[PDB]
Amino acid sequence: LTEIEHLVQSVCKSYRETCQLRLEDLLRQRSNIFSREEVTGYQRKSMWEMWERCAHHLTEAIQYVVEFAKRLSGFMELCQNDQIVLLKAGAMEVVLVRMCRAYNADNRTVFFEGKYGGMELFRALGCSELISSIFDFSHSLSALHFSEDEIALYTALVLINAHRPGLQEKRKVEQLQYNLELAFHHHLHKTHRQSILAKLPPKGKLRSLCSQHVERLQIFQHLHPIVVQAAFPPLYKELFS
Ligand SMILES: C[C@H](CCCC(C)(C)O)[C@H]1CC[C@H]2[C@@H]3CC=C4C[C@@H](O)CC[C@]4(C)[C@H]3CC[C@]12C
Ligand SMILES: Cc1cc2c(s1)c(-c1ccc(C(=O)O)cc1)nn2C(=O)c1c(Cl)cccc1Cl
């Protein structure tokens, strides 16, 4: 078949092997919600304990996105500088997109440590405005009801972005980007789902939310640092250290 139909296939496979939580599991557990008492239990934890828990979960989620990127056709062929630039700009944007699969718009809950809970679970972090923004962004995306294949192709394009500042081989990121844009557009046409294009988040909004998120993470890491066994050291070193 066409290069483009094979690329649709390699991206969707990459996503399925690295999606971290299975959509069917997430959907099934929606009814499994934290009680008043369990919520109070989380709210009473120190900011230090809640940070340790949340940092760990976020680091693990980033590591699935790194593995996703490393399985995208052409990514490993980029110079290591460009692999770092794309993942440093993009990997947390992909996590915030992946969150919509684990988010229930009906009751504004997210799947966290085995059950669904609202943003007030995270009270002890003293991050309410930022956490509210992250929930609202997921609330936005949920209205699309992304298919597994749409989120695979969309999140590939979140990463493979030739406009990221600092790319050494910009022409080669463009070639990859053009093919992934064609794959996504082709797939939406084949599935009668072009309607989602007008509804995708403004790009500026994903960038500024995620930029705020990573700045807060870097402040917490500076105050109370957790240590990570880095899946991709060169990238980590430009984030931890
Ligand atoms: C919004 C809250 C709190 C963020 C706190 C802050 C601002 C200090 O980072 C975070 C904490 C843990 C996060 C989840 C961790 C892992 C996953 C799985 C991945 O497949 C999709 C995203 C998700 C559900 C994260 C969402 C954001 C969460 C709840
Ligand atoms: C754009 C990116 C943001 C971001 C990335 S990438 C990573 C990360 C993680 C692991 C690896 C690896 O190689 O295993 C590499 C990179 N952490 N991280 C954070 O914001 C972060 C998190 Cl999630 C938790 C605690 C502290 C911090 Cl600072």
Curated annotation (Swiss-Prot):
Gene Ontology CC terms, in alphabetical order: chromatin; nuclear body; nucleoplasm; nucleus
Residues in NR LBD domain copies: 3-241
Location of this chain's protein in the cell: Nucleus
Renumbered ranges of motif AF-2: 235-240
A GO MF term: DNA-binding transcription repressor activity, RNA polymerase II-specific
Keywords associated with the record: Activator, Biological rhythms, Developmental protein, Disease variant, DNA-binding, Metal-binding, Nucleus, Receptor, Transcription, Transcription regulation, Zinc, Zinc-finger
Superkingdom of origin organism: Eukaryota
Reported induction: Up-regulated in the state of obesity.
Any GO BP: negative regulation of transcription by RNA polymerase II
Tissue expression: Isoform 1 is widely expressed in many tissues, including liver and adipose, and highly expressed in skeletal muscle. Isoform 2 is primarily expressed in immature thymocytes.
Domain free text: The AF-2 (activation function-2) motif is required for recruiting coregulators containing LXXLL motifs such as NCOA1 and NCOA2.
Pathological association: Immunodeficiency 42: An autosomal recessive primary immunodeficiency characterized by increased susceptibility to concomitant candidiasis and mycobacteriosis. Candidiasis is characterized by persistent and/or recurrent infections of the skin, nails and mucous membranes caused by organisms of the genus Candida. Mycobacteriosis is characterized by infections caused by moderately virulent mycobacterial species, such as Bacillus Calmette-Guerin (BCG) vaccine, environmental non-tuberculous mycobacteria, and by the more virulent Mycobacterium tuberculosis.
Entry function: Nuclear receptor that binds DNA as a monomer to ROR response elements (RORE) containing a single core motif half-site 5'-AGGTCA-3' preceded by a short A-T-rich sequence. Key regulator of cellular differentiation, immunity, peripheral circadian rhythm as well as lipid, steroid, xenobiotics and glucose metabolism. Considered to have intrinsic transcriptional activity, have some natural ligands like oxysterols that act as agonists (25-hydroxycholesterol) or inverse agonists (7-oxygenated sterols), enhancing or repressing the transcriptional activity, respectively.
Homology family: Belongs to the nuclear hormone receptor family. NR1 subfamily.
Subunit note: Interacts (via AF-2 motif) with the coactivator NCOA2 (via LXXLL motif). Interacts with the corepressor NCOR1. Interacts with CRY1. Interacts (via AF-2 motif) with the coactivators NCOA1 and PPARGC1A (via LXXLL motif). Interacts (via AF-2 motif) with PROX1. Interacts with FOXP3. Interacts with NR0B2.
Protein name in the entry: Nuclear receptor ROR-gamma
Organism of provenance: Homo sapiens
Residues of the full protein shown: 267 to 507 of 518
